Design a protein around this nucleic acid. Structure first.
Lengths: 591, 166, 123, 134, 37, 229, 37
RNA sequence: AUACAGUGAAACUGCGAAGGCUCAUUAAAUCAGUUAUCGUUUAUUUGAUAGUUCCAUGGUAUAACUGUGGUAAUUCUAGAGCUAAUACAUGCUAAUCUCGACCCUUUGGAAGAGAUGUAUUUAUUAGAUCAAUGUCUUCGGACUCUUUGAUGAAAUAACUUUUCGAAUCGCAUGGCCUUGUGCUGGCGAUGGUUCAUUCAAAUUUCUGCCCUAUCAACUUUCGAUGGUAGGAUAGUGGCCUACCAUGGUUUCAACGGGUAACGGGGAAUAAGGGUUCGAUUCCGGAGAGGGAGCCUGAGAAACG
């Protein structure tokens, strides 16, 4: 008969709204008691009478789900629903602790709340009943103790009711009457917030606009309290950033920066949070990261600091200038952030950024020589913008070489901090050399020569565009250096980049031989570069299977010579992974 | 039907002198029950133990599926206009699998007006049938084996995919 | 790529893998070809044994006629008379096989009256 | 191609090559005795049959061993007895003279073809025959 | 067009029925003066 | 009318006992009548082996299973209550069923080759063996042709033997049926003659199939005891 | 009749308290294998 | 033993018969092994395997049986009257599962929110990451490209004339005091849905002893060869039909020619001297007067 009544519900829509409201009115007239319970509360209730009431709430749920647009709603059905919900609350909170009929009437009450939320799920902007405050005060006096009750990952009876009441136009009258956002913000600022906290945050972010478009001054102060909740909930959207739904945070922070500027410490906290929005997770997308940096700039245009947020915005621009993502949109937002950071370093940054980012002109090569002849003492964002131009951004090749040489000149004129800046230059040149670049690899080689300012002739002859006598002199220089972990790793990386699967050129056997000779000359340095030799042999072993295995086989055979010389010298090690790699070679032998 | 065996016919080499055998039980070809429109009558035939097979002949209540949301709802049958597994099958107006048959789409109107409010994002050449009532939909289920008429609606790409044909 | 009626489509663009040492080309993973009976996306599953040989004719579409000469140690007239075999095979979106072209096939699920093998390799 | 379980090639045959002249020479040069009966106990029907041959007393010993071993009398199964007992006793009174069968001397069956002239150790190399000697 | 329209002669139907001499109760002159127009 | 595996003397009868259906196949098992009556000879005829089956002395795989033609296949531990008879029967080197005598702590378990692992219904991992013990929930690293160890009081897998290069394998099938020694070679082909190869006294070589071979332990330590000569 | 109504209900609730608890009792062993894997 | 109580003609029941003769001549297509069926049926064997409840027990209609009879007559019959079910078919049925605001510290979970199947036939998708023994140590960390591992490349929207949530029994008075069968309460066989195995069958990969070119062409003349879709199927399948393409086999032996094909092929046992006698499965498929159509079953075009 459940399947039969489900068929009756699936065919219970064929009659008009008059007959649907008449059948709903007959369903309401079972145990309404509007003479007894339309004033305040009910007169009496029973277990089987609540079972008629639980069945009435279930029939209301089935009727609303069947006719989930119109539902034939009536104030008699509303009064019967309020009488049933109040009788469920009264019986559950007035019965003794025996829990059988109490859990029956509690699962009657949760299902009745689900059927009540179904009415607003079906007929939301259709009725908007003007006597809402009766049921609103009834449900408030029932669920006053539901302060932090709806704070969970699945608690969505009163949380969904609050979201429905907040996502309307004029049904927020019961919200702005006394309180909805107070208890919602209490459970939102609860510290054990699960991932419905983002749902409540998006609901309040969408519901601040109705409280702002409302002409009532009470709703204006409630919108002020929603901005105050956005300022007092400065840990929830931080700690709940476990998914890629950071567009809600970027949509609230832009709304907050466009709406309310209430404290300089609040603007500094917003700028530091949007700095953590780019220094917290690397999976933030382009529009979200651009709007987050623009919201940090919008808080900084109002109430920024002069030293602390100055350095924070300078670090933000020093990351965003190395990024420059999304076809110069992030570069334009980074130039705006550097012009809003309000320092002397930021002033030189905005000058040397606007003088180069003038919409694809020769002003980039003009401004590189301009700041070279007029070298600025900030130099951090200058080295960022001149190392993005030294990377695979095609123009400013000689200007990139002059920028690296001028950074070396400043690092020699310092004579400590600018040597740690040269450490960052070397840690950038390492990832530049281990890459598929053509102009930026030559620029990193020029930076290696400027850091080297026999060895200088070797570097300039490795970057000589000749490659036959040049590679012969490189092999002879490796022989002279044989007769350095990261340094020889960088040299062998540049050599492997110049001979990296370029099988349209000859002497690849001597090129791999020079790679293995530099690897042997690094592996002779056992006290330092044994780890680097192990890493280079490991990367060559990964390349021995990664889609190409002709010259990598000879690289494996000639990197075995370091092991042969080490075993002849030993005449303790790690035999285990060596034997397992021997088993892997035996498996590659059965290919 | 007759048979399922290669013994009555020639292979990929061209052989002769067949004269093979009295045909067994397990070469059982039943008669082709061309399912039509009528009053719902399904013959419950037996095979392979208690393997009842529903052979539908006059089925109506097609469960056809709204595509973009996957809403299989109940409707009637009108007639198949194009099915060149037999071009006389559409002349005789039967109902087999993978046929394109017409449906009075009034419960789909009810579901759209029930879970969207207003009446009429969806394509225009099926919005014309949203207005008129008869939409094209293709049968998925097998009434000759499973006895049922299920199907999927035509929505856009598959619609024009058949409308350019016929 | 649609010359017939009745919703020419994969049957649940779609992509799978039979495994067992046979690659799937990138157009056969994500391409506009339907792969109704080509086993990489397909509806068929692989089993059985794998046979290798050159071809004779690829005249009709979805018919790859392999030749297969093999050694057999004849004891009767103590000389090896040379073997020859034939098998029709459905197409794959990986190689337009012309005359020559030693290729291999795996046993699966009889497609026509005489084909149980579908191409999985060209070399 | 592939393997196929062949009990006819891992079954104990040992009878295609069992020749009575070789077996008699082995019994002569055996240097361990032979389990012969107390002399009257092996004649059969008061002399109406033969004495009994060596194969017949071996088969009788096998039958009595199986007999005591699983507690069952053998029977008078008609087809096998009308073959084997009558044909066996008629060739016994044909060829068994005084407890000795002389049937073999009247029979063409090459000794060296099947039972001598080793097939596995055929030594078809000068080096293999040299290593087989030394 | 293989099994389509075999113009052959078949064995059991070659004498399945037998004709009739007079046939139509009308005359052929009655046919001509029946549908002259 | 007999197979080769039963070690059945020819002077027995005319009709050979077809085993009934059960765990193992017909071609890889011996029933209880050919076990008890005419191999280790606890009976003399079918009447009294049915009599002791009605008395229920047999306790094969820890359950009684009173039946004459019950197909005891590979290493089903036949247990007899009187004189605490514990019998694990394996293959010898020439194709028959060598029935080794074991003790109680060894007959408290058996082992079984896994045939397939399934996501059958409702998220339940799944394992079958040659007696078909559908036991719940092994680890995800159960490949085909590994070896579970059954509990034989409940049904649970207690220990697990992984199939890889360097494991002690038993071959039941084809022209290698019943050999032990498991190491000269490994060769996995792609559809036939694929195996791990088995030594001899002079460490000779052998070819078989994957499904016709299954692991029993390690190189020197199988926890099955084995007969000797 | 009523004693059978006692025994039927008792064996039914005992069958539930055996089977529906033992099923989760080895599903938790699957959870242990998944945590250790 | 005044509602049953042992013998038991004739009736329902469970099963029995669980595999027997003759006739016309098929060249790996009859047969034997083998590969596979996530391409499929399965009684029995074996191992596993069920959560939707509004204002003390459900209905006549038939036997056997009586009684009246017909007919030459049957395991042929018809009226009239009763009467039972594991026959027919309507219908009676406690509250336990996770996340846990709070914890009072161990006797730890009270509030709130989310739960709950099968059988049939339809669609979207769950089905790239983090942990170090190390890159730099700045003896702190952004760590995966290197050195090794891991989750990982049935959840839901509907039909169906939908099956069920034990009217089976045995062993054990046993525990409790809800003040009386108030709760019985412990276990095992038979049930009972589904999966897998086993059995058997059907297809299917390949292999296997006559001479054959005076058989050099066959195949489209039961689709020839393949593709697409449907029908039928236990399912794969030109197995059948619509449409389309003109294919496919062959001198590396297609296709065709016959018998000591009452003989042969291991089809199998071999025998301690018979060297093609010498153990057997099968010659081919049919047939229950003759073709045709239908039915039954886990299995059939049934020796019944």
């Amino acid at each position: 008969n459940g399947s039969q009544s489900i068929k009756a519900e699936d065919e219970k829509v064929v009659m008009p709204y008059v007959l649907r409201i008449f059948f709903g009115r007959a369903q309401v007239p079972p145990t309404s008691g509007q003479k007894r319970s339309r004033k305040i509360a009910v007169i009496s209730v029973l277990p089987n009478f609540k079972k008629p009431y639980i069945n009435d709430f279930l029939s209301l749920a089935s009727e609303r789900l069947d006719y989930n647009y119109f539902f034939g709603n009536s104030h008699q059905i509303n009064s019967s629903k309020a009488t049933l919900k109040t009788i469920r609350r009264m019986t559950g909170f007035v019965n003794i602790v025996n829990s059988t009929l109490s859990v029956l009437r509690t699962n009657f009450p949760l299902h009745t709340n689900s059927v009540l939320q179904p009415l607003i799920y079906s007929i939301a902007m259709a009725y908007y009943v003007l006597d809402t405050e009766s049921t609103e005060e009834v449900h408030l006096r029932k669920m006053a103790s539901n302060l932090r009750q709806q704070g969970l990952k699945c608690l969505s009876s009163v949380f969904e009711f609050v979201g429905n009441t907040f996502d309307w136009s004029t049904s927020m009258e019961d919200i702005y009457a006394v309180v909805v956002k107070p208890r919602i913000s209490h459970f939102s600022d609860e510290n054990l917030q699960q991932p419905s906290s983002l749902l409540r945050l998006f609901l309040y972010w969408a519901h601040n606009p109705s409280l702002y478009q409302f002409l009532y001054y009470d709703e204006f102060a409630t919108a002020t309290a929603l901005m105050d909740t956005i300022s007092n909930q400065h840990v929830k959207e931080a700690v709940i950033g476990p998914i890629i739904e950071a567009a809600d945070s970027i949509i609230r922070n832009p709304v907050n920066d466009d709406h309310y500027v209430d404290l300089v410490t609040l603007i500094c906290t917003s700028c530091l949070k949007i700095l953590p929005s780019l220094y917290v997770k690397l999976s933030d997308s382009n529009s979200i990261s651009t709007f987050l940096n623009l919201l940090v700039s919008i808080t900084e245009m109002g109430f920024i600091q002069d030293d602390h947020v100055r350095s924070r915005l300078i670090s933000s621009l020093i990351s965003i200038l190395k990024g420059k993502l999304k076809k110069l949109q992030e570069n334009d937002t980074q130039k705006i952030l550097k012009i809003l950071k309000l320092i002397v370093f930021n002033y030189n940054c905005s000058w040397s950024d606007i003088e180069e980012l003038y919409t694809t002109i020769s002003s980039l090569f003009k401004t590189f020589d301009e700041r070279n002849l007029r070298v600025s003492l900030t130099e951090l964002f200058i080295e960022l913008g001149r190392k993005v131009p030294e990377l695979e951004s095609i123009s400013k090749l000689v200007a990139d070489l002059n920028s690296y040489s001028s950074s070396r000149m400043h690092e020699y004129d310092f004579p400590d901090f600018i040597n740690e800046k040269p450490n960052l230059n070397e840690a950038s040149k390492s990832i530049s050399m281990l890459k598929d670049i053509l102009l930026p690899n030559i620029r990193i080689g020029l930076r290696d020569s400027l850091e080297e300012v026999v060895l200088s002739y070797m570097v300039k002859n490795t970057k000589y565009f000749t490659d036959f006598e040049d590679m012969a002199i490189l092999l002879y220089n490796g022989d002279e250096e044989a007769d350095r972990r990261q340094r020889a790793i960088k040299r062998l990386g540049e050599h492997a980049h110049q001979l990296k699967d370029n099988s349209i050129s000859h002497y690849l056997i001597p090129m791999i031989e020079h790679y293995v000779f530099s690897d042997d000359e690094r592996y002779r340095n056992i006290g330092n570069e044994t780890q680097i030799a192990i890493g280079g042999l490991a990367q060559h072993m990964s390349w021995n299977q990664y889609k190409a295995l002709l010259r990598r086989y000879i690289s494996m055979l000639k990197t075995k010579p370091n092991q042969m010389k080490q075993a002849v010298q030993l005449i303790t090690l790690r035999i285990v992974r060596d034997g397992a790699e021997s088993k892997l070679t035996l498996s590659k032998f059965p290919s | 039907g007759i048979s399922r065996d290669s013994r009555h016919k020639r292979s990929a080499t061209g052989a002769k002198r067949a004269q093979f055998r009295k045909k067994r039980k397990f070469e059982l070809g039943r008669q082709p029950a061309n399912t039509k429109i009528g009053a719902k009558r399904i013959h419950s035939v037996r095979t392979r133990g208690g393997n009842k097979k529903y052979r539908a002949l006059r089925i109506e209540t097609g469960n056809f599926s709204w595509a973009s949301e996957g809403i299989s709802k109940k409707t009637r049958i009108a007639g198949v206009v194009y099915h060149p597994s037999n071009n006389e099958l559409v002349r005789t107006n039967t109902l087999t699998k993978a046929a394109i048959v017409q449906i009075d789409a009034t419960p789909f109107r009810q579901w759209f007006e029930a879970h969207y409010g207003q009446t009429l994002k969806i394509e225009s050449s099926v919005e014309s049938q949203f207005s008129a009532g008869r939409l094209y939909a293709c049968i998925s289920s097998r009434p000759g084996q499973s006895g049922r008429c299920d199907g999927y609606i035509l929505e856009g790409e598959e619609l024009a995919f058949y409308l350019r044909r016929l | 790529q649609s010359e017939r009626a009745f919703q020419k489509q994969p049957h649940i663009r779609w992509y799978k893998n039979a495994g067992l040492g046979f690659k799937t080309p990138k157009t056969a993973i994500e391409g506009s070809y339907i792969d109704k009976k080509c086993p990489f996306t397909g509806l068929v599953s692989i089993r059985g044994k794998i046979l290798t040989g050159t071809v004779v004719s690829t005249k009709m579409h979805r018919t790859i006629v392999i030749r297969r000469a093999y050694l057999h140690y004849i004891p009767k007239y103590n000389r090896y008379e040379k073997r020859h075999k034939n098998v029709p095979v459905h197409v794959s979106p990986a190689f337009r096989v012309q005359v020559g072209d030693i290729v291999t096939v795996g046993q699966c699920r009889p497609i026509s009256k005489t084909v149980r093998f579908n191409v999985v390799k060209v070399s | 191609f592939e393997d196929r379980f062949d009990a006819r090639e891992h079954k104990d045959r040992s009878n295609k090559s069992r020749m009575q002249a070789m077996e008699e020479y082995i019994r002569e040069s055996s240097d361990q005795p032979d389990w012969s009966a107390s002399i009257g106990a092996d004649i059969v029907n008061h002399g109406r049959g033969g004495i009994k041959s060596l194969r017949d007393t071996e088969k009788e010993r096998r039958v009595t061993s199986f007999e005591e071993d699983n507690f069952t009398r053998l029977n008078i199964t008609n087809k096998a007895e009308k073959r084997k007992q009558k044909q066996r006793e008629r060739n016994a009174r044909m060829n068994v003279i005084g407890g000795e069968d002389f049937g073999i001397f009247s029979s063409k069956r090459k000794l060296e073809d099947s039972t001598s002239r080793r097939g596995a150790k055929k030594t078809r190399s000068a080096w293999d025959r040299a290593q087989r000697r030394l | 067009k293989g099994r389509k329209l075999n113009y052959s002669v078949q064995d059991p139907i070659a004498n399945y029925e037998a004709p009739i001499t007079s046939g139509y109760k009308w005359s052929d002159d009655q046919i001509d003066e029946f549908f002259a127009g | 009318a007999a197979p080769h595996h039963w070690l059945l003397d020819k002077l027995s009868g005319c009709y050979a006992p077809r085993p009934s259906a059960g765990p193992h196949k017909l071609r890889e098992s011996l029933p209880l009548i050919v076990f008890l009556r005419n191999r280790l000879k606890y009976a003399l005829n079918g009447r009294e082996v049915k009599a002791i089956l009605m008395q229920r002395h047999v306790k094969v795989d820890g359950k009684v299973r009173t039946d004459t033609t019950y197909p005891a296949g590979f290493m089903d531990v036949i247990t007899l209550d009187a004189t605490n008879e514990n019998f694990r029967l394996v293959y010898d080197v020439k194709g028959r069923f060598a029935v080794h005598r074991i003790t109680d702590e060894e007959a408290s378990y058996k082992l079984g080759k896994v045939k397939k692992v399934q996501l059958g219904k409702k998220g339940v991992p799944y394992v079958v063996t040659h007696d078909g013990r559908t036991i719940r929930y092994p680890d995800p690293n159960i490949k085909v042709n590994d070896t579970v160890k059954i509990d034989l009081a409940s049904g649970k897998i207690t220990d697990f033997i992984k199939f890889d290069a360097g494991k002690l394998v038993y071959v039941t099938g084809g022209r290698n049926l019943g050999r032990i020694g498991t190491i000269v070679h490994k060769e996995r082909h792609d559809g036939g003659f694929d195996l791990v190869h088995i030594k001899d006294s002079l460490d000779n070589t052998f070819v078989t199939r994957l499904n016709n071979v299954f692991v029993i332990g390690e190189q020197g330590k199988p926890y099955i005891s084995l007969p000797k000569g | 009749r009523l004693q059978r109504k006692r025994h039927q209900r008792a064996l039914k609730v005992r069958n539930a308290q055996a089977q529906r608890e033992a099923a989760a009792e080895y599903a938790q062993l699957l959870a242990k294998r998944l945590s250790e894997r």
